[PDB]
Amino acid sequence: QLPADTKDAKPLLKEMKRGKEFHVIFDCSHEMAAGILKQALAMGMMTEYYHYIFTTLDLFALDVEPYRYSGVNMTGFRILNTENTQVSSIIEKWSMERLQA
Amino acid sequence: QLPADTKDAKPLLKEMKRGKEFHVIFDCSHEMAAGILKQALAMGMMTEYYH
């Protein structure tokens, strides 16, 4: 379990490195899924050994630039049908409604 | 040798990961020593194996 009060998972991820746990299933929101990976990159846990399955359906909204060349095995689902031209046109119109954010 | 023109050592560090080279002696300045480590953290080479 992630810690309740703080948002620093260094005491959790150090117990996961020491116990040799290379296969992790995170049950988080995507606001906290980006928070663990910056605390898993500050530790030595973004290697080619680790596999991360994420329960959330908003993995596609992560800004994964630094984890892209590491060779990490991030996996997850997506229900948002971003392949259709008609569906992708509505999402482009959604970005033209959130200018002040 | 680090690349001359660019300051992106991704084609160098990928050949060092693939060749299993865990013991590296950098001959750099400290302005470029900080530049390699951000390009060694973007790859999976800041582990407990590397010296």
Curated annotation (Swiss-Prot), chain A:
It comes from the Eukaryota. Glycans are attached at N73. Highest expression is found in the olfactory lobe, piriform cortex, dentate gyrus, hippocampus, granular cell layer of the cerebellum, and in caudate-putamen. It is found in: Cell membrane; Postsynaptic cell membrane. Sumoylation mediates kainate receptor-mediated endocytosis and regulates synaptic transmission. Sumoylation is enhanced by PIAS3 and desumoylated by SENP1. Ubiquitinated. Ubiquitination regulates the GRIK2 levels at the synapse by leading kainate receptor degradation through proteasome. The postsynaptic actions of Glu are mediated by a variety of receptors that are named according to their selective agonists. This receptor binds domoate > kainate > quisqualate > glutamate. It does not bind AMPA without coexpression with GRIK5. Belongs to the glutamate-gated ion channel (TC 1.A.10.1) family. GRIK2 subfamily. Homotetramer and heterotetramer with GRIK5. Tetramers may be formed by the dimerization of dimers. Assembles into a kainate-gated homomeric channel that does not bind AMPA. Can form functional heteromeric receptors with GRIK4 and GRIK5. Can form functional heteromeric receptors with GRIK3. Interacts with DLG4. Interacts with NETO2. Interacts (via C-terminus) with KLHL17 (via kelch repeats); the interaction targets GRIK2 for degradation via ubiquitin-proteasome pathway. Ionotropic glutamate receptor that functions as a cation-permeable ligand-gated ion channel, gated by L-glutamate and the glutamatergic agonist kainic acid. L-glutamate acts as an excitatory neurotransmitter at many synapses in the central nervous system. Binding of the excitatory neurotransmitter L-glutamate induces a conformation change, leading to the opening of the cation channel, and thereby converts the chemical signal to an electrical impulse. The receptor then desensitizes rapidly and enters a transient inactive state, characterized by the presence of bound agonist. This is Glutamate receptor ionotropic, kainate 2. The chain holds residues 203 to 303 of 908 of the full protein.
